RNA sequence: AUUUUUGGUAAGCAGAACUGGCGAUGAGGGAUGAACCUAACGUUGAGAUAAGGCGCCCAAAUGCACGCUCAUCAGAUACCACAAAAGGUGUUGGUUCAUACGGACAGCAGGCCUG
RNA sequence: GGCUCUUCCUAUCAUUGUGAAGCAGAAUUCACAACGUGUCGGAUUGUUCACCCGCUAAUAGGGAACGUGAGCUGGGUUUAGACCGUCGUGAGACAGGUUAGUUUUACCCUACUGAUGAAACGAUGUUGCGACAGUAAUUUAAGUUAGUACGAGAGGAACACUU
């Protein structure tokens, strides 16, 4: 029982900003502060090409700082904000000031209620529960 | 070993006319004219008499000998073909999804849609001399008529085959268009 | 559907013979295999009939 | 694992029996050479089917028991134990060796026993009644498949396991010249001391 | 190396016997190449050969007669560069038992028999 | 041994088209034409191997002087320093652990990559032909098909079209 099943469509092209090992903020109230990036789904690489995730992706991660109940296990998360500038159909490039993610079950459900900070557009279309829990969506 | 002489005798009946030139056989009857080219065998095709046609092969080996009777039989088919034609009936078989059919006025083409519920369009163009027909009373059948056995049997084939079911147990599914009746005389 | 027809299909589909060697489906009631790989081998079986 | 039979197939050696020069030669997996109804009379099983090794080779005892067990199961099931006498003519006398630092001396311990067979030596013999000849011929052929290379199957016109031709056998029947022990028949000559012949009882 | 041989699963392995040979040896043939086949060498011309060849590379038969063979993996030969158990309604021979106008086989027929 | 790179094998892991099943569907297994293309990111270990964490259509098995040191690297192995253990009276020894311990030369020929280029049927431009050589795209997912066919139920496809 794994994967991204609750994704609602195609995810747009975003410059991949979070390779493996990347540690990002965790914006949910799950009680985990951060997410250590282990893999990213749907990737077959080239030799020695680091697996990379971006806004909207579903990663496989672990919790480095947070509730002792959460760390030491392998969880899935969904990237919300990234600091790596990507580009949108208007030609403008954007970025947030942090790298943020929300722990989720493979079905696309969040474990948590409030999501701290804004969530990127590119995450909403893909993940309606995440979108539901957004305070703001840019 | 090598066989000396082998012959086969083809009868020619009322209203049939036959022509052998350099292995090229022509047969004209009431229903039309059919021609076939035998240039590939060393056989002797004797000048036909309105009664008969004699086929001979000389200094032959077992493999060669068979070509005789087979060319002969092909002739039998040309003849019978121009006397009484050839008609086939193909039953159109489906379990759940009804096979939908559109046949042109020439009778020269068939469209098959909705096979196993597939959204694809099947196109089959009938061979020369072959006419396809479906009536109100046909009870889900097709009818292919023509003078030349080959073109008709082959058209039936192309049809049956266009609809072969794939990537599933063939013995349970069994959807398809199959030949119910072969070698009918009209 | 329509056993009158099921007959037909089943005769086109389940009613053949299979080569214990090249796997080809040969005509029922036939003695030999028509495929070069086995040299027309003797041993053949009935294509396994469906269930009841 | 046991070394492949193709190693010992050809008889390259001079014969190595289990002798007082051989220590710790093992046994042979074929211990019993007779199956079926052994008690039968020459009269009861007239016809013989023989497996004759066509080749010159060394057959492993294990191979023997193989072909044998096989032929037995076949015969017993398809006719009846009562209806066949199955005899293994050949015995596995020859001992194979196997050399198990380097080559310093290669003389090996005893691996197993084999029977040394020459072209035309009878391997198996079955005696049966006419109705069953085919079945015998059948199972023997199958046992031929448990065997190295070529062997052939044959029907003898002699009587059972006897040296007599069925004709001689019949004439000697008629004339009361025959004495019966099991598979064996004895013939009576003019050379015998009269204290034997039945008449001076 | 031929034949005979022992140890060894085996080896272009390790050992022995008789006669040679190769080493110490060229020439023609095995395309090629120590120990195979012919054949043993002074300088040179002719003729006829051995081994092996004669469609072209290549001297010399696309000679003249027989049988057998079609490969959607043909075949093409001593030592030599490997193939086995097992299979084929491909084709041709041969072996042993059978049928047939007191009409067979097969097919279609028809009621084992019958057209 | 790894790194780098190229090519070959097929006893095919995946992808293409099929045959077979104790093939309902889904999944799976056996076989055929077949390498054309692909066959990944990290823990520990000098490692080949092994074992785990993962993604993936798949995470196939091999060859090329156990491919590849004037291409690197030098962790392992195998000099000279030194520790322990065991052995030896000893000097010393381990097919047992530890720790420190140099990696030279290309300007030649070829090879390959690129670059000029004399000269025949007169010279010199411009526009072309094209022998031959090399070739390249391979997959995946989503929508729709559709909660559909099949199936008692659980479950659960495909072709076409579109991105
Ligand atoms: Mg860390
Ligand atoms: Mg790497
Ligand atoms: Mg299939
Ligand atoms: Mg299936
Ligand atoms: Mg076979
Ligand atoms: Mg001799
Ligand atoms: Mg020697
Ligand atoms: Mg000698
Ligand atoms: Mg000699
Ligand atoms: Mg010397
Ligand atoms: Mg010499
Ligand atoms: Mg001369
Ligand atoms: Mg000629
Ligand atoms: Mg293969
Ligand atoms: Mg197998
Ligand atoms: Mg690494
Ligand atoms: Mg190396
Ligand atoms: Mg040291
Ligand atoms: Mg001491
Ligand atoms: Mg040491
Ligand atoms: Mg220099
Ligand atoms: Mg160059
Ligand atoms: Mg000019
Ligand atoms: Mg010019
Ligand atoms: Mg130019
Ligand atoms: Mg080309
Ligand atoms: Mg889809
Ligand atoms: Zn076959």
Q: Which ligand does the CA of A23 lie closest to? A: 1
Residue B84: both structure tokens together? 């009484």
- Residue C24 CA distance to nucleotide F33 C1' (Å): 14
CA D78 – CA D70 distance, rounded (Å): 12
Q: Residue D25 forms beta bridges with which residues?
A: none
Q: CA-CA distances (angstroms) from residue D201 to A86, D172, D173, D180?
A: 127, 22, 22, 19
Q: Which window residues (21-60, chain D) lie with Cβ within 7 Å of strand E? A: none
Listed residue (D83, D84, D85, D87) closest to D67, CA to CA? D87
Per the CB < 8 A criterion, the answer to whether B161 and B115 are in contact is no
Q: Do C5 and B171 touch (CB under 8 A)?
A: no
Q: Distance (Å) from the C-alpha of residue B88 to the closest C-alpha of chain C?
A: 15
Give the torsion sign (CA, B75, B78, B83, B87).
positive
- 3-state class (DSSP) for residue B161: helix
Residue B110: both structure tokens together? 């068939």
CA A24 – CA A35 distance, rounded (Å): 5
Name all chains with 3 or more CB-CB pairs below 8 Å to chain A: none
CA D50 – CA D122 distance, rounded (Å): 6
| Beta-carbon contacts of residue A122 (< 8 Å; ≥ 6 apart) | A11, A12, A14, A55, A56
Strand B131-133 with B141-146, pairing = antiparallel
Interface of B with C (CB under 8 A): 91, 93-96, 160, 169-172, 174-176, 178, 180
| Beta-carbon contacts of residue B41 (< 8 Å; ≥ 6 apart) | B23, B64, B67, B71
CA D144 – CA D114 distance, rounded (Å): 17
- 3-state class (DSSP) for residue A61: strand
Q: Distance (Å) from the C-alpha of residue B104 to the closest C-alpha of chain C?
A: 25
Listed residue (D7, D145, D127, D16) closest to D68, CA to CA? D145
- C46–B contact, CB cutoff 8 A: no
Q: What is the C-alpha R_g of chain D?
A: 21
CA D160 – CA D174 distance, rounded (Å): 18
- 3-state class (DSSP) for residue D39: coil
Eight-class DSSP state of A46: -
Q: What is the C-alpha R_g of chain C?
A: 13
Listed residue (C42, C37, C3) closest to C22, CA to CA? C37
For E10, nearest residue by CA–C1' is: D7
The rounded Å distance from CA D66 to ligand 15 centre is 24
Q: Distance (Å) from the C-alpha of residue B35 to the closest C-alpha of chain C?
A: 31
Q: Do B180 and C10 touch (CB under 8 A)?
A: no
| Beta-carbon contacts of residue D14 (< 8 Å; ≥ 6 apart) | none
A17 touches strand F (CB under 7 A): no
For residue D24, which phi and psi values (nearest 5 degrees)? 60, 35
Entry resolution in angstroms?
A: 3.5
Name all chains with 3 or more CB-CB pairs below 8 Å to chain B: C
> For chain C, what's the residue count?
52
Q: Which window residues (29-48, chain C) lie with Cβ within 7 Å of strand F? A: 37, 47-48
A touches C, CB cut-off 8 Å, minimum 3 pairs? no
Per the CB < 8 A criterion, the answer to whether B89 and B181 are in contact is yes
Residue found under tokens 């079986």: C45
Report how many helices (DSSP H) and strands (DSSP E) chain B contains, helices first.
3, 13
CA C21 – CA C44 distance, rounded (Å): 8
Q: Give D86-137 as a DSSP string.
A: EEE-----EEEEE---TTS--PPEEEEEEEEE-TT-EEEEEEE-GGGHHHHH
- Chain centroid to CA B112: 22
For residue A113, which phi and psi values (nearest 5 degrees)? -120, -65
Quickly count: other Cβ atoms within 10 Å of residue B10's Cβ: 21
CA B84 – CA B184 distance, rounded (Å): 9
Residue found under tokens 């005789």: B68
Chain C contact set for B95 (CB, 8 A): 1
CA B38 – CA B10 distance, rounded (Å): 16
C40 touches strand E (CB under 7 A): yes
Quickly count: other Cβ atoms within 10 Å of residue B147's Cβ: 22
Ramachandran quadrant class, C21 (left: phi over 0; alpha: psi -120 to 50; beta: rest): alpha
Q: Distance (Å) from the C-alpha of residue C43 to the closest C-alpha of chain B?
A: 23
Residue found under tokens 């495929």: C35
- C9–B contact, CB cutoff 8 A: yes
Q: Which window residues (30-89, chain B) lie with Cβ within 7 Å of strand F? A: none
Q: Do B172 and C50 touch (CB under 8 A)?
A: yes
Residue D170: both structure tokens together? 């019949």
SS3 assignment for B61-120: CHHHHHHHHHHHHHHHHHHHHHHCCEEEEEEEECCCCCCEEEECCCCCEEEEECHHHCCC
Q: Do B176 and C14 touch (CB under 8 A)?
A: no
Chain B contact set for C9 (CB, 8 A): 93, 174-176, 178
Nearest to B94 among C1, C8, C10 (CB): C1
Q: Do B91 and C8 touch (CB under 8 A)?
A: yes
Sheet containing strand B52-60, edge to edge, reads B3-11, B52-60, B44-45
Listed residue (A71, A90, A86) closest to A123, CA to CA? A86
Most C CBs within 10 Å: which of B170, B173, B182, as the mutation test of the C interface? B170
Number of alpha carbons in the 13 Å side-chain half-sphere of residue D184: 3
Q: Method of determination? A: X-ray
Nearest to C13 among B94, B170, B180 (CB): B170
Burial class (CB in 10 A: 0-12, 13-18, 19+), B110: buried
Q: CA-CA distances (angstroms) from residue A62 to A26, A32, A82, B143, C4?
A: 11, 10, 18, 69, 64
Residue found under tokens 């969506």: A137
Ligand 5 ion: Cβ-proximal residues, 5 Å cutoff: C 38
């Amino acid at each position: 029982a794994r994967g991204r099943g609750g994704q609602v469509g195609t995810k747009a092209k975003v410059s991949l900003g979070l390779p493996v090992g990347a540690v990002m903020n965790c914006a949910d109230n799950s009680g985990a502060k951060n997410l250590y990036t282990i893999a990213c789904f749907g990737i077959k690489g080239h030799l020695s090409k680091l697996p990379s995730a971006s806004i909207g992706d579903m990663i496989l991660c672990s919790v480095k700082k947070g509730s002792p109940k959460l760390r030491k296990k392998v969880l899935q998360a969904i990237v919300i904000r990234q600091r790596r500038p990507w580009r949108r159909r208007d030609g403008v490039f954007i970025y947030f000031e942090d790298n943020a993610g929300v722990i989720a079950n493979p079905k696309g459900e969040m474990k948590g209620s409030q999501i701290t900070g804004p969530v990127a557009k590119e995450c909403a279309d893909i993940w309606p529960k995440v979108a539901s829990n957004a305070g703001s969506v840019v | 070993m090598r066989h000396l002489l082998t012959e086969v005798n083809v009868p020619i009946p009322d209203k049939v006319t036959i022509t052998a030139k350099q292995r090229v056989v022509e047969v004209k009857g009431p229903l039309g004219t059919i021609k076939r080219a035998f240039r590939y065998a060393s056989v002797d095709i004797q000048k036909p008499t309105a009664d008969n046609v004699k086929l001979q092969i000389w200094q032959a080996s077992r493999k060669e000998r068979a070509v005789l009777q087979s060319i002969a039989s092909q002739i039998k088919n040309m003849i019978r073909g121009v006397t009484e034609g050839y008609k086939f009936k193909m039953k159109l078989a489906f379990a759940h999804f009804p096979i939908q059919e559109a046949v042109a006025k020439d009778g020269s083409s068939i469209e098959i849609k909705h096979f196993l519920g597939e959204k694809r369009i099947r196109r089959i163009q009938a061979l020369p001399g072959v006419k396809i027909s479906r009536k109100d009373e046909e009870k889900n059948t097709l009818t292919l008529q023509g003078i030349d056995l080959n073109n008709v049997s082959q058209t039936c084939a192309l049809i049956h085959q266009s609809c072969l079911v794939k990537e599933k147990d063939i013995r349970q599914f069994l959807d398809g268009i199959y030949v119910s009746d072969k070698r009918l005389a009209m | 559907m329509e056993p009158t027809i099921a007959a037909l299909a089943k005769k086109y589909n389940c009613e053949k013979k299979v080569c214990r060697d090249c796997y080809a489906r040969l005509p029922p009631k036939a003695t030999n295999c028509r495929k070069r790989k086995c040299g027309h081998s003797n041993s053949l079986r009935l294509k396994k009939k469906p269930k009841e | 694992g046991r070394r492949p039979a193709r190693c010992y197939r050809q008889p390259k050696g001079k014969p190595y029996p289990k002798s007082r020069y051989n220590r710790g030669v093992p046994d042979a997996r074929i211990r019993i050479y007779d199956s079926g109804r052994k008690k039968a009379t020459v009269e009861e099983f007239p016809y013989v089917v023989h497996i004759v090794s066509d080749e010159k080779e060394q057959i492993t005892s294990e191979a023997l028991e193989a072909a044998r067990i096989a032929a037995n199961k076949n015969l017993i099931k398809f006719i009846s134990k009562d209806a066949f006498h199955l005899r293994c003519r050949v015995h596995p006398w020859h001992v194979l060796r196997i050399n198990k630092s380097g080559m310093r001396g290669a003389f090996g311990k005893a691996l197993g026993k084999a029977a040394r067979v020459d072209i035309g030596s009878i391997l198996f013999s079955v005696r049966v009644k006419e109705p069953h000849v085919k079945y015998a011929i059948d199972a023997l052929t199958r046992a031929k498949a448990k065997f190295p290379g070529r062997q052939k199957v044959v029907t003898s016109q002699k009587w059972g396991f006897t040296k007599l031709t069925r004709a001689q056998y019949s004439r000697l029947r008629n004339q009361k010249k025959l004495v019966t022990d099991g598979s064996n028949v004895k013939v009576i000559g003019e050379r015998g001391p009269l204290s034997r012949l039945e008449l001076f009882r």
